[PDB]
């Protein structure tokens, strides 16, 4: 599966970063998710063509192994929510999630 | 693009489950995929299964034994039909659509998976009696 | 210029037009590989890897 560090906390202004690891990321794409408490998730990293770094707009995300960091510049207070990495396996058969990650912000 | 869900809201335990979501306001509702995916409270996001127009479907194979997601394009509406309802399952459940962009050849897989970009209502399913 | 009438039966399995046809435009296609560049340097440790994306 994955592997997601269960609560990350950071003071506003700062840079926050979100290691997601786990065994098909050797490979495969990841997703991001935002899901406000009593509300929908929000895709709020998409792709575009596969030599193109998907999109960098006000987040981005690295990668090195098997693990991907989850950069988020600029913390602001209002972003509070848990946040989730998706991916498929390598096989390409089923689609699992992340485990969890609320933001705590000071 | 607008979408929402069909729920009873109220389901017995060891019976079975009729959920769907009507789409509008979709210029081409024919080339994305239509998926469901569940939500325990305070747990992560459970992936269920997904429906393309061609007919083909995949599943969760833990949940596969028990669930089938079946399709109207007409009324561009796709059921949900599981069975053997247990207390577990009880949470919030949702239909999305995971968008398709298309660099050349469909027949060639020349298509990658834009993400899923709009999610559904929400729906209390809440299985007691 | 039409005739009449005449038998004569073919062999197209056996002539001399289609052996002769395979030696032309191999020795014609290498006639025009001549001049090029000869373009032997390359011949060394390349090394590689994905394209990164
Ligand atoms: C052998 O036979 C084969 C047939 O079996 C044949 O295969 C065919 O090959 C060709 C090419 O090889 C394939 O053509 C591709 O088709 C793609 C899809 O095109 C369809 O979809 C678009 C999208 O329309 C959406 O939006 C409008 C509103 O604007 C709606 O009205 C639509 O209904 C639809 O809406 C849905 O999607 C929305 C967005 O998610 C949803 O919100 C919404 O709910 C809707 O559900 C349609 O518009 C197309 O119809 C016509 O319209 C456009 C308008 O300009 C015309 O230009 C077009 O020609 C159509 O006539 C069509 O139905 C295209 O995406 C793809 O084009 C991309 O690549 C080319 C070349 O690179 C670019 O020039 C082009 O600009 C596109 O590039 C963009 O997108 C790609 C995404 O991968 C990026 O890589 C690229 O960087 C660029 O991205 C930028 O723009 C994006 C959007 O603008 C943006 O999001 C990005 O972030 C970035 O900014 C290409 O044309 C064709 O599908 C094959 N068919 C099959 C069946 O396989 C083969 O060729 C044959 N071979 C031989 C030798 O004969
Ligand atoms: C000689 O020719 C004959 C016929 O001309 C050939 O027989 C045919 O062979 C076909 C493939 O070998 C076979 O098609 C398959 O049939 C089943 C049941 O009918 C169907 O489910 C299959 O559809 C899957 O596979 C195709 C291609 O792989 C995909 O395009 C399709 O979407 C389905 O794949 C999805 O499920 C897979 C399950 O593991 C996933 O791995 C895969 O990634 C994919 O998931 C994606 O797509 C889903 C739909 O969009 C989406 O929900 C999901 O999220 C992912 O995005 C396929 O149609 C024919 O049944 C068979 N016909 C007969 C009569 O036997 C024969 O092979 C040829 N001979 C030889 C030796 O090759
Ligand atoms: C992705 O790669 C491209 C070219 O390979 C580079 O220009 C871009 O800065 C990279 N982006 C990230 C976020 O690493
Ligand atoms: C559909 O929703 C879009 C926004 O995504 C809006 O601009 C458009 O007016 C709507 N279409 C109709 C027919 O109302």
């Known amino acids: 599966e994955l592997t997601q560090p269960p609560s990350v906390s950071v003071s506003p202004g700062q840079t926050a970063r979100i290691t997601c690891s786990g065994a098909?990321?050797?490979?495969?794409?990841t997703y991001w998710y935002r899901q406000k408490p009593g509300q929908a998730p929000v895709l709020i990293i998409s792709?575009?063509?596969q030599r193109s770094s998907g999109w960098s707009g006000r987040f981005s995300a690295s990668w090195s192994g098997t693990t991907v960091t989850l950069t988020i510049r600029g913390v602001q207070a209002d972003d509070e929510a848990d946040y989730y990495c998706?991916?498929?396996?390598?096989?390409?058969?089923?689609?699992?999630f992340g485990g969890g990650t609320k933001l705590t912000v000071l | 693009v607008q979408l929402r869900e069909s729920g009873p809201g109220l389901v017995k335990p060891s019976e079975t489950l009729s959920l769907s979501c009507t789409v509008s306001?979709?210029?081409?509702?024919?080339?994305?995929?239509w998926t469901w995916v569940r939500q325990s409270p305070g747990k992560a996001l459970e992936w269920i299964g997904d429906?393309?127009?061609?007919?083909?479907?995949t599943y969760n194979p833990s949940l596969r034994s028990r669930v089938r997601i079946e399709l109207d394009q007409s009324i561009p509406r796709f059921s949900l039909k599981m069975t053997s309802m247990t207390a577990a399952d009880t949470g919030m459940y949702y239909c999305?659509?995971?968008?398709?962009?298309?660099?050349?050849?469909?027949?060639?897989?020349?298509?990658?998976?834009?993400?899923?970009?709009?999610w559904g209502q929400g729906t209390a399913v809440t299985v007691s009696s | 210029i039409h005739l009449e009438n005449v038998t004569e039966e073919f062999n197209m399995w056996k002539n001399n037009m289609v052996e002769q046809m395979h030696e032309d435009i191999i020795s014609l296609w290498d006639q025009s590989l001549k001049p090029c560049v000869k373009l032997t340097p390359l011949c060394v440790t390349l090394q590689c890897t994905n394209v990164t994306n």
């Open positions: 998706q991916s498929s396996d390598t096989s390409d058969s089923y689609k699992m």
């Open positions: 792709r575009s063509s």
């Open positions: 306001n979709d210029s081409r509702p024919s080339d994305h995929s």
């Open positions: 098909p990321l050797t490979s495969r794409f």
């Open positions: 429906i393309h127009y061609n007919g083909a479907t």
């Open positions: 999305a659509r995971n968008a398709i962009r298309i660099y050349g050849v469909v027949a060639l897989g020349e298509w990658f998976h834009y993400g899923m970009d709009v």
